[PDB]
């Protein structure tokens, strides 16, 4: 269960998912390397990422990087996963290794629909300073991203 679940999920087959979640499965089950479904899930698929989370698993685990899925779904732009993350009380301020919050690495990327969507309707603390000391402003005023930098100043 634990690896099919987490196979079906990481192959963003729905169907397949749903279908072993008719079995008695613990949606948190790791891998064998030491992933959770939610956790390897291919991104794009909010759908598979909801009915995980119905299931009670847990969005704050991190992996080998100490990200957590919220950090890869805005790192990537994929709004719909990130906000049925949310929904689900994912923590929006969890960290990454170095201090990043999901905000910095959306804004780092350019993923201008997602950063808008955390300054305006999450409680991402848009003044956290990453351990270097870099806010997710700071890092999109060094990574180019004009539209994010305007668009965060604009609001925050």
């Not at 299931?55 to 919220?70: E, H, Q, S, Y």
């Not at 993350?85 to 923590?91: F, G, T």
């Not at 309707?121 to 999109?140: F, P």
């Not at 180019?144 to 965060?152: I, P």
Request: charged letters at 20%.
């Amino acid at each position: 269960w634990g690896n099919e679940l987490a196979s079906a999920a990481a192959r963003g087959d729905l169907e397949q998912l749903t279908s072993l979640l008719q079995n008695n499965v613990n949606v948190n089950a790791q891998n064998g390397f030491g992933r959770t479904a939610l956790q390897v899930m291919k991104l794009g698929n909010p759908e598979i990422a909801r009915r995980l989370l119905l299931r009670g698993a847990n969005p704050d685990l991190k992996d080998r990087t100490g990200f957590a899925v919220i950090h890869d779904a805005a790192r990537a732009g994929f709004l719909d996963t990130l906000q049925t993350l949310l929904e689900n009380q994912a923590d929006v301020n969890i960290e990454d290794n170095e201090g990043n919050l999901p905000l910095h690495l959306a804004a780092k990327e350019g993923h201008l629909r997602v950063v808008e969507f955390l300054v305006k309707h999450t409680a991402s603390n848009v003044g956290h300073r990453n351990h270097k000391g870099d806010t997710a402003c700071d890092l999109a005023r060094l990574y180019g991203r004009n539209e994010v930098v305007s668009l965060m100043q604009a609001n925050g």
